[PDB]
């Protein structure tokens, strides 16, 4: 179940419980410090649950909570856009669109079974994002990768960009 934002965040449903600035959020179904305009009462099916981040009002700036700080009512929250640029760290996360290995071989689709038998079945690891055949890192491996369509190369890693040019 999806842990990153697309567009203004309507369908966001990760579990970020704090504004862009540290402050832990107010549960949506509470009244102190503030009194909110979207109660799981009023806008029921709008993922208004827990204290997690949400965009009920269809805000331009996206997902946002009310802060437990009486002093600033509500504020926005941080939340990686989807798609992906460059891997963060070793990118246990990577949700990007790259399909050609280091060697430079186009990846074999996760869905597929050729030219290689493999148990990385997306069915089996739904949250794991085995889209088409985008390079990935399910298993705490060095850096994402795939099973390559060169029948003699099972798999190998790809050359994903580090955003900030073990981990820090």
């Amino acid at each position: 179940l999806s842990e990153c934002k697309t567009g203004n965040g309507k369908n966001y449903r990760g579990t970020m419980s704090k504004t862009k600035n540290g402050i832990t959020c107010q549960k949506w179904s509470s009244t102190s410090p503030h009194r909110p305009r979207f109660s799981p009462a009023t806008h029921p099916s709008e993922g208004l649950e827990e204290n997690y981040c949400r965009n009920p009002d269809n805000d331009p700036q996206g997902p946002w909570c009310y802060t437990t700080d009486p002093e600033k009512r509500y504020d926005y929250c941080d939340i990686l856009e989807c798609e992906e640029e460059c891997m963060h760290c070793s990118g246990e996360n990577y949700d990007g669109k790259i399909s050609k290995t280091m060697s430079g071989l186009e990846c074999q689709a996760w869905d597929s079974q050729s030219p290689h038998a493999h148990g990385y079945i997306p069915s089996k690891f739904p949250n794991k994002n085995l889209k088409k055949n985008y390079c990935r890192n399910p298993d705490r491996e060095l850096r994402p990768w795939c099973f390559t369509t060169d029948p003699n190369k099972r798999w190998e890693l790809c050359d994903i960009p580090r955003c900030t040019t073990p981990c820090k």
Partner: peptide
Amino acid sequence: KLTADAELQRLKNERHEEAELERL
């Protein structure tokens, strides 16, 4: 070892283990 991890862990190892054995 149930869950993913146990599982992935294993896959990975299996891979790792197999490259291991081709470079040889």
